[PDB]
Design a protein around this ligand. Structure first.
Ligand SMILES: Nc1nc2c(ncn2[C@@H]2O[C@H](COP(=O)(O)OP(=O)(O)OP(=O)(O)O)[C@@H](O)[C@H]2O)c(=O)[nH]1
Ligand SMILES: [Mg+2]
Lengths: 64, 431, 79, 609, 184
């Protein structure tokens, strides 16, 4: 059985600068800020925590 | 999978939305509480984790009187607590207090909620917006939204339902202004703008049906079914289906020309219906009749450029073909020179759904004709003239320049609606 | 109920050791066993007579229609 | 035309001020119930009737001797109201005394019985003096000044020359009577700058001070001998919706009421509560059983109370519908439960001893329909909103509501015996057919023929069709199984009730033309045409389950026993004053029960098995 | 709770201009009093809480002790008038290692001390009305090696005068602050 993670809790707070960009071509993530200047110590351990989720709008943001 | 987010900006939007959402709740059996006592709901609703199909819509109106009614009524459970958004004061029939002042205060909450509603979608196929040109929210806040969604969902089509300034009958004295100033900032952002006045639908309620003293309620329910008919192919099964994108690519010619109309077909009352056959031929021809259109603009005073006969119910594909052939012959209905076909069709094998407590009857067939006529220039020229008359003696312009809006904007808007007029002329001319 | 003497002291002796001051070894424990037309329905929502959802009543009654108006074709109006 | 028997009466018109009264013999209550005034016995089911009056009575006035009882009715504006004297010992009309145009608000007798003050009319307000000896007028004057407004109250004193009126506009005026010159002489009482709106008067037993109950929640005590104020009411914690009843005791105390039911016994100087008990409904009458140990309080939501002074413990002795009651229906099998159905309320009652067991109130709303499903698991109701509410038989919870059922109200309703279908009428003239599932309440068909409005649904014994009386002169036998019609029964009357004769081959129809007529279910032809009541129209019928007797009531305020095969009449009446709306044979063929335009539930011992 | 709220650049939990400012707040008054009105320099209503005991009378932003408001905004700014008396206030935060942690600022404390469930620090008020900016994301980092998640409580003690207790996304200068958030 899975446990709710910090990737979920940081999402409805809105800390992630992401939105599910709906391409007709596919599902990409639109980034409101540059990926290069992101704090990698805050986001990589947090985006890896979202792998455990299987519901669509959260597992896609972890995968992509 | 194929979902569409519906946004209701302005008293109208909400009022018409309280009618459109009622119908959806019935077609896809979802009781007011939000419970279904298989996948058609996706297009409009979204299941939680306990049969709480919650609407995929956003209701926004600065003044908290129309959304508070929803919050304290039948569909208090259906709509998500935070999907209904309000402010404090109103735009007081002033574009400025919706696109420059109060609007700004609510644009970053309305937008954030659309994002959340779009991030849970798997195939956003369009953003339907229910606005009312006359008001300051249905012209100002809707401009902010369409001027924002464009810089956030460029590809995503943005269809737009709109109660248009009725020929003579009108409520506010500044409606002329709001409309012109809002087309300037919505013509370059919307994909196609479905237009419905109020004079016409009032008549259709008295004559075609039998309702003396028709109110907004009645009007909103017929507009509600036009939406059901357009979105039916995306949620029920059919023989020739038509998705949101397929509307624009077969209805919008020269980019700017994007102002289609809307006519239902079996708008008959109970007593009358029984005594009638309502065949594909009849309902089809009834749609082209210049007294069933819902935007008083004498179809005969112009040329159709791209009709879209979207049907629903028992419609044998053969009868359809025949029916449309007849229409092509009759010369009263004249098409242009650069549109040989101009007849995108569509059949959805789902009989019209009777709103328990409406005025329409149990017809087992219907057609929704979305036509791109070049007669809407007449209506556009009327509003254009009204502006001039008032702007000449800078009438209610002090109110507009106080909430943020240079007098220049008025001039650009006028010169841009003039371009719309010129364009429609250079689209009716022959080769 | 009690399996042994510790639970007899631990159970509902009604002796608060914070509050009980200068008791005796008898009042150290005081067990609880020692001590001892019309059905009215109100609808929650309270609406108004001027918020009825429906068609609006003609001031002329249906059988008469004293303000006798018709359509352009002269049809009836029902209701 | 043998009279049956009139056992038991539920009903009280609490909307009048100064209603429920107890004559000084201390053994019978007196209260108004329409254009009649009842005499209910204390400690005995015995009750009698004072007939007379054309329209609804607004006043009662009983004497200190008890020998004379007077009353006063409303009428259409421009027409003359009638003040009817009576004798309590023989209950018979002895005066008509018609002077006041419009209506009446208040009556009071002289201490020893020889004059009557009968101030009458928001249209023609003018105080008059009557004679109890000559049955004739004596004096007359306008009861209010031209600067001030209109007066609605009267009282006498301990000397028969004073007559005192208050107003809803402040006309506190102590008059004096001048027989030789045949005139009255007023004197406005100065009260400082306290202009108030007051609706109740009581005086002390030793003629000291008169007491007022204002709308502000303030007891005004003033002097009739110096024409001045003496003491204002509660300084802080004032009363609710204005004091609508005051009754000064033999002591220096006073039982002060309220528009909420806060009956308070307070003393003179502070007007501060001593013993408070909350009554349901706004207090409209505070009587005294003579000496004052058992004072009976009446309320506008008509509930007669019984309070002992020395403990202030109540006993609800009477409970009534305070508005017009329509549709009485019985549960299947048993005959000891009612469905008394009115504006703002739905009630059930025990037949043998009249006592309500459930009250179902949907705010300020009206229910023109009620029905009981065969399983006895839902009381189906038809409300004015357009929603078919189905309450539960016990508790009273709303099991389901059918939102937007009909446009202009749902008037007539009926369930089916299979407990799956509720046939619904409408004020727009539509017959809807709903399906009652375990979780859904859907629509199956919208059958629309009737133009005006539907009046009465009736369903047969084994469900295949239903008859729907309508206000446009049509009664259709709709085919319920195949969702169509079968008949086009037509007449020139506004139909108001239809019933299925057992062994269904013919239907009995009623209406406005009083032409009670058997109609066949095949070919829809006239069968008989009986004459109803010679006075008005017929609202309501019920045929017994043996098809030998159908009962009838109408605008003619009168229950009518009619056997079937021959059209002879076994008429009874002498019932209640108020338009009989519906009537229902008991399932056990043991009582017949009729409702009326004024809230009244009558039971008659049904003859003729 | 404040969880479904967007929590934008501004969020106010108490503002003295309104019908019931202390609606979500819980009032505990003991040998003191609470009032709402005095115009000394700004001609506006400012809430007063003061009493002879500073640690006993106070106001707490979540009324129910089980409920906690969740605000992700790192900067915590209140506008408090100096009264030259004892004033303290609380803030309780949730940490990334899931520890209920508290901070205290006081007028009557000489030196600061940090240890695991309470960090108490001194404070010097100005002469009159001032605003103070309690950077929660930095005080949860200097005091303990910890990141900020969300606050849970704020509590304001006696001998102070209160207007516009609010959170902010980041520190704002006086000019870019909007008109309804200004000191004057
Ligand atoms: N068809 C239809 N039109 C409506 C309805 N309600 C409002 N309208 C139209 O809305 C126009 C004016 O806009 P408003 O109703 O004031 O709504 P708004 O856009 O929020 O304007 P403000 O509240 O002043 O900012 C009127 O001219 C009406 O034609 C409705 O229920 N049905
Ligand atoms: Mg508005």
């Amino acid at each position: 059985p899975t446990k709710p993670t910090a990737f979920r809790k940081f999402y409805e707070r809105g800390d992630f600068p992401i939105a599910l960009e709906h391409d007709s071509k596919g599902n990409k993530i639109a980034w409101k800020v540059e990926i290069e200047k992101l704090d990698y110590h805050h986001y990589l351990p947090l985006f890896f925590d979202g792998l455990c989720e299987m519901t669509f709008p959260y597992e896609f943001f972890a995968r992509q | 999978m194929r979902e569409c987010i519906s946004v209701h900006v302005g008293q109208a939007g909400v009022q018409i939305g309280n009618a459109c959402w009622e119908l959806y709740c019935l077609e896809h059996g979802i009781q007011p509480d939000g419970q279904m006592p298989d996948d058609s709901f996706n297009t409009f609703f979204s299941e939680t984790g306990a049969g709480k199909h919650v609407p995929r819509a956003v209701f926004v109106d600065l003044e908290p009187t129309v959304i508070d009614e929803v919050r304290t009524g039948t569909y208090r459970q259906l709509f998500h607590p935070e999907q209904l958004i309000t402010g404090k004061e109103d735009a007081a029939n002033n574009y400025a207090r919706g696109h420059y002042t109060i609007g700004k205060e609510l644009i970053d909450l309305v937008l954030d909620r659309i994002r959340k509603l779009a991030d849970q979608c798997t195939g956003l196929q369009g953003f339907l917006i229910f606005h009312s040109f006359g008001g300051g929210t249905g012209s100002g806040f809707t401009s902010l939204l369409m001027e924002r969604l464009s810089v956030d969902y460029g590809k995503k089509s943005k269809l737009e339902f709109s109660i248009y300034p009725a020929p003579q009958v009108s409520t506010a004295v500044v409606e002329p202004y709001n409309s012109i100033l809002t087309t300037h900032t919505t013509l370059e952002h919307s994909d196609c703008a479905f237009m419905v006045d109020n004079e016409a639908i009032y008549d259709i309620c008295r004559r075609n049906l039998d309702i003396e003293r028709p109110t907004y309620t009645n009007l909103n329910r017929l507009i509600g079914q036009i939406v059901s008919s357009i979105t039916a192919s995306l949620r029920f099964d059919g023989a020739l289906n038509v998705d949101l994108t397929e509307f624009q690519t077969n209805l919008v010619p020269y980019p700017r020309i994007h102002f289609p109309l809307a006519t239902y077909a079996p708008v008959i009352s109970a007593e009358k219906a029984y005594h009638e056959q309502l065949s594909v031929a009849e309902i089809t021809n009834a749609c082209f009749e210049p007294a069933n259109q819902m935007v008083k603009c004498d179809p005969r005073h112009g040329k159709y450029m791209a009709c879209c006969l979207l049907y629903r119910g028992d419609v044998v594909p053969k009868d359809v073909n025949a029916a449309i052939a007849t229409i092509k012959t009759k010369r009263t209905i004249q098409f242009v020179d650069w549109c040989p076909t101009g007849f995108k069709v569509g059949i959805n094998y789902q009989p019209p759904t009777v709103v328990p407590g409406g005025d329409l009857a149990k017809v087992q067939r219907a057609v929704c004709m979305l036509s791109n006529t070049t007669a809407i220039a007449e209506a556009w020229a009327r509003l254009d003239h009204k502006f001039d008359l008032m702007y000449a003696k800078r009438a209610f312009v002090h109110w507009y320049v106080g909430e943020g809006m240079e007098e220049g904007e008025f001039s650009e808007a006028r010169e841009d609606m003039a371009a719309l007029e010129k364009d429609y002329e250079e689209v009716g001319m022959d080769s | 109920e009690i399996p042994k003497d510790d639970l007899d002291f631990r159970l509902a002796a009604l002796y608060n050791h914070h509050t009980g001051t200068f008791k005796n070894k008898s009042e150290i424990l005081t067990h609880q066993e020692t001590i001892q037309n019309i059905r009215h329905w109100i609808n929650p929502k309270k609406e108004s007579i001027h918020s009825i959802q429906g068609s609006i009543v003609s001031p002329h009654t249906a059988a008469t229609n004293g303000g006798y108006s018709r359509k352009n074709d002269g049809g009836f109006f029902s209701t | 035309a043998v009279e049956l028997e009139l056992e038991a009466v539920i009903g009280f018109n609490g909307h009048v001020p100064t209603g429920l009264k107890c004559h000084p013999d201390q053994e019978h209550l007196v209260y108004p119930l329409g254009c009649t005034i009842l005499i209910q016995a204390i400690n005995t089911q015995e009750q009698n009737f004072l007939h007379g009056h054309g329209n609804n009575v607004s006043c009662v006035a009983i004497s200190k001797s008890g020998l004379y009882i007077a009353s006063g009715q409303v009428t259409f504006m421009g027409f003359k109201a009638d003040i009817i004297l009576w004798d309590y010992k023989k209950r018979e009309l002895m005066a008509r005394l018609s002077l006041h145009k419009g209506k009446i608000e208040a009556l009071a007798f002289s201490p020893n019985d020889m004059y009557l003050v009968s101030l009458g009319g928001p249209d023609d307000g003018s105080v008059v003096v009557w004679s109890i000896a000559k049955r004739e007028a004596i004096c007359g004057s306008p009861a209010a000044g031209l600067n001030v407004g209109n007066a609605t109250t009267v009282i006498f004193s301990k000397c028969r020359d004073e007559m005192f009126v208050t107003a809803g506009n402040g006309t506190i005026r102590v008059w004096e009577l001048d027989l030789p010159n045949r005139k009255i002489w007023p004197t406005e009482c100065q009260t400082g700058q306290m202009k108030r709106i007051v609706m109740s008067i009581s005086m002390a037993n030793d003629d000291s001070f008169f007491y007022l109950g204002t709308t502000t929640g303030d007891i005004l005590k003033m002097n009739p001998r110096t024409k001045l104020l003496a003491d204002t009411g509660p300084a802080k914690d004032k009363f609710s919706l204005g004091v609508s009843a005051i009754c000064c005791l033999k002591m220096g105390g006073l039982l002060v009421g309220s528009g909420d039911g806060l009956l308070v016994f307070c003393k003179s100087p502070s007007y501060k509560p001593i013993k408070k008990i909350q009554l349901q409904g706004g207090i409209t009458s505070i009587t005294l059983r003579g000496e004052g140990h058992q004072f009976f309080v009446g309320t506008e939501e008509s509930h007669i109370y019984r309070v002992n002074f020395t403990n202030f413990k109540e006993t609800l002795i009477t409970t009534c519908h305070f508005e017009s009651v329509e549709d009485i229906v019985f549960p299947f099998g048993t005959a000891e439960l009612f469905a008394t159905c009115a504006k703002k309320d739905i009630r059930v009652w025990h037949t043998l001893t009249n006592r309500e067991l459930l009250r179902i109130t949907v705010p300020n709303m009206t229910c023109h329909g009620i029905d009981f499903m065969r399983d006895g698991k839902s009381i189906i109701s038809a409300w004015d909103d357009g929603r078919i509410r189905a309450f539960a038989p016990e508790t009273g919870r709303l099991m389901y509501v059918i939102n937007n059922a009909h446009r202009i109200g749902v008037t007539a309703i009926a369930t089916t015996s299979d407990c799956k279908r509720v046939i619904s009428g409408g004020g727009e003239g539509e017959v809807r057919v709903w399906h009652i599932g375990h979780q859904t309440q859907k629509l199956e068909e919208a059958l629309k023929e009737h133009k005006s409005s539907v009046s009465c649904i009736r369903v047969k014994k084994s469900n295949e069709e239903c008859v729907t009386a309508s206000t446009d002169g049509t009664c259709i036998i709709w085919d319920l199984v195949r969702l169509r019609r079968n008949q086009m029964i037509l007449a020139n009357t506004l139909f108001q009730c239809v019933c299925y004769h057992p062994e269904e081959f013919q239907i009995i129809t009623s209406g406005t033309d009083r032409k009670i007529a058997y109609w066949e279910v095949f070919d829809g032809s006239v069968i008989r045409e009986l004459d109803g009541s010679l006075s008005g129209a017929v609202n309501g019928m019920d045929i017994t389950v043996e098809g030998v007797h159908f009962v009838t009531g109408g605008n003619d305020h009168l229950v009518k026993v009619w056997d079937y095969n021959e059209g002879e009449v076994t008429h009874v009446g002498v019932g209640h004053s108020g338009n009989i709306t519906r009537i229902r044979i008991s399932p056990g063929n043991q009582y017949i029960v009729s409702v009326s335009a004024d809230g009244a539930i009558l039971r008659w011992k049904y003859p003729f098995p | 709770m404040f969880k479904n709220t967007f929590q934008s650049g501004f969020l106010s939990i108490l503002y003295s201009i309104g019908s019931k400012p202390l609606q979500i707040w819980d009032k505990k008054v003991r040998n003191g009093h609470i009032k709402r009105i005095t115009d000394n320099d700004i001609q506006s209503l400012v809430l007063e809480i003061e009493g002879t005991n500073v640690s006993t009378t106070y106001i707490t932003c979540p009324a129910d002790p089980k409920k906690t408001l969740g605000i992700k905004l790192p900067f915590l700014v209140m506008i408090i008038k100096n009264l030259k008396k004892y004033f303290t206030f609380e803030v309780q935060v949730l940490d990334d290692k899931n520890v209920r942690r508290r901070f205290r600022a006081s007028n009557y404390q000489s030196t600061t001390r940090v240890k695991p469930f309470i960090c108490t620090m001194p404070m010097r008020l100005d002469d009159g009305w001032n605003q103070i900016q309690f950077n929660l994301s930095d005080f949860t980092r200097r005091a303990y090696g910890t990141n900020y998640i969300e606050t849970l409580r704020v509590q304001i003690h006696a001998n102070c005068r209160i207007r516009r207790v609010y959170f902010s996304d980041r520190l704002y200068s006086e000019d870019e602050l909007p008109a309804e958030f200004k000191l004057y």
